[PDB]
């Protein structure tokens, strides 16, 4: 069924699973028209499909041309997501296909279920977790590749960089969600924390800086303070 605080560790067992987040598939900027009306201009988007055990991130870039001449784009966006996830599964060898796909928003359940009718044995599941995957666009290297795309394109990343050499996927996922939660709550301050120290750099083949174990503890603390902070500024506590 649904994924929540009680069955949280199933994410890190050895059954292949993918999270799918569609919150950055259809993106627009709202602006005024010369006649003083309002219109949208779409910009490039992405499907965020993540294996939480391995860190493998299948970033499918949604180029604005896919919306051209289409109606009801927020609804099409869910079906286009489901179409691309299904295409990805079909493209993978059988032993790499997921056993479960967990969607971060319940509106994706029916579109994905319909596009995956050919895989009756893949469980399509919702979650009650409020995961911060919408902030994936705050990771500079991911935002850059999406905005520069001139055509539909799939790009593969490992969102954990080399962390799994030193920590478990449970701890790596916990770090990732804390980073993304901070970037979603105060992007400016979050990025300030991550880059305040010019001596720590981001390797060309990584997304995040090359923190030592001890420096990650400092960073993780600073991110928690930020989230508590913004929580006070928001609610006046």
């Amino acid at each position: 069924g649904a994924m929540n605080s009680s069955n949280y560790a199933e994410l890190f067992n050895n059954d292949i699973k993918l999270f799918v987040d569609d919150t950055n598939v259809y993106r627009v900027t709202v602006h005024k028209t010369f006649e003083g009306n309002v219109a949208t201009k779409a910009i490039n988007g992405c499907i965020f499909t993540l294996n939480p055990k391995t860190g493998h991130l299948f970033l499918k870039i949604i180029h604005t041309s896919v919306w051209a001449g289409q109606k009801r784009l927020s609804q099409l966006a869910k079906w286009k997501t489901a179409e691309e996830v299904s295409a990805l599964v079909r493209s993978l060898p059988k032993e790499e296909q997921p056993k479960q796909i967990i969607v971060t928003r319940k509106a994706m359940l029916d579109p994905l279920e319909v596009h995956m009718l050919d895989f009756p044995n893949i469980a399509i599941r919702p979650t009650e977790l409020r995961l911060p995957f919408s902030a994936a666009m705050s990771i500079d290297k991911l935002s850059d590749v999406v905005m520069k795309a001139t055509e539909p394109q799939m790009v593969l990343f490992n969102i954990y960089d080399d962390w799994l050499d030193r920590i478990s996927s449970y701890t790596a996922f916990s770090r990732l969600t804390l980073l993304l939660r901070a970037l979603k709550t105060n992007e400016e301050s979050a990025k300030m924390i991550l880059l305040s120290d010019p001596t720590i750099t981001i390797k060309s083949y990584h997304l995040w800086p090359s923190f030592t174990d001890e420096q990650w503890i400092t960073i993780e603390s600073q991110m928690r303070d930020l989230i508590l902070t913004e929580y006070g500024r928001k609610y006046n506590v």
Partner: protein, 300 residues
């Protein structure tokens, strides 16, 4: 007019004939039902006074043979039977009429209710849904499950309704996943009407038959089938104009006939609100929408 004689009435029972019903007391001198209109299917149904568990009954067509009811004290129910000896049957019926031991099918002559509820119900088709080929009549009861229900357990005793499943490969063409799921016209018109049923009359036949089994026996799987068949039409952008008009009439008489007190368990809130207020055909069921809003405004 035709007659369904009863050997006797040894147990107190509420007897139904189509939309009519009457109480018979244990060992009362009741010997059947006369003046049954020829030309329609009919259903004769039973609910024991002592165990309202199991409503059960028999669909039959008097044109297809001479049928009678006889209580079976071993199996504990009123059983329909065919009498092949035609002269024996006439002689039996005539004695019971002369002695006036029969209730008269009480049709008011203005009243087209039964015709309007059964216009498309074919008796040979019913034998297809309720498989028991040695009899010309068909037994149904409250607890019988449908072939689809058994997929999700005795197959001999199942209701073989047409399987409708909106998230099935049958309902969804590869490459039209969104189109076919949001507009079920392909599934209605090509898969079901052109492929399985052959024509709308056949489609209406199962739909009407599903309702009557839901209403008379409280058969839950029949009610699911009735709502599925409604929803497939209402969720289709492209439906022949003649089918929508007839659907409106069909549903109007079904809603009109339903017991007011049974609306809570026979009517699916989601399906009806969707059908009347959100679907492609939300504006095409004027008669049904008007009777639903005036009779069951709660559900909406």
């Amino acid at each position: 007019m035709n007659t369904v004689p009863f050997t006797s009435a040894p147990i107190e029972v509420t007897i139904g004939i189509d939309q009519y019903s009457f109480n018979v007391k244990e060992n009362q001198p009741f010997h059947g039902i006369k003046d049954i209109p020829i030309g329609h299917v009919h259903v004769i149904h039973f609910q024991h006074a002592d165990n309202s568990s199991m409503r059960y009954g028999y669909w039959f067509d008097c044109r297809m043979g001479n049928f009678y009811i006889q209580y079976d004290p071993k199996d504990g129910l009123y059983k329909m039977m065919e009498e092949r000896d035609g002269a024996k049957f006439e002689n039996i019926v005539h004695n019971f009429k002369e002695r006036q031991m029969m209730v008269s099918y009480p049709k008011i002559d203005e009243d087209d209710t039964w015709y309007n509820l059964t216009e498309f119900v074919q008796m040979d088709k019913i034998r297809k849904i309720v498989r028991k080929d040695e009899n010309q009549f068909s037994y149904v009861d409250s607890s019988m499950t449908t072939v689809q229900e058994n997929e999700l357990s005795d197959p001999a005793h199942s209701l073989n309704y047409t399987v409708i499943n909106f998230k099935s490969r049958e309902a969804i063409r590869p490459g039209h996943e969104m189109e076919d799921f949001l507009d079920k016209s392909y599934y209605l018109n090509t898969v079901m009407l052109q492929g399985i049923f052959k024509n709308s009359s056949n489609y209406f036949g199962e739909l009407q038959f599903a309702f009557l089994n839901a209403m008379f026996f409280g058969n839950y799987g029949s009610s699911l089938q009735w709502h599925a068949m409604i929803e497939l039409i209402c969720s289709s952008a492209t439906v022949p104009k003649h089918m929508l008009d007839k659907l409106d009439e069909i549903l109007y008489y079904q809603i009109k006939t339903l017991p007011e007190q049974y609306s809570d368990i026979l009517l699916n809130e989601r399906v009806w609100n969707i059908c009347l207020y959100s679907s492609f055909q939300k504006n095409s069921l004027h008669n049904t929408e008007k009777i639903m809003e005036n009779k069951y405004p709660e559900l909406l």
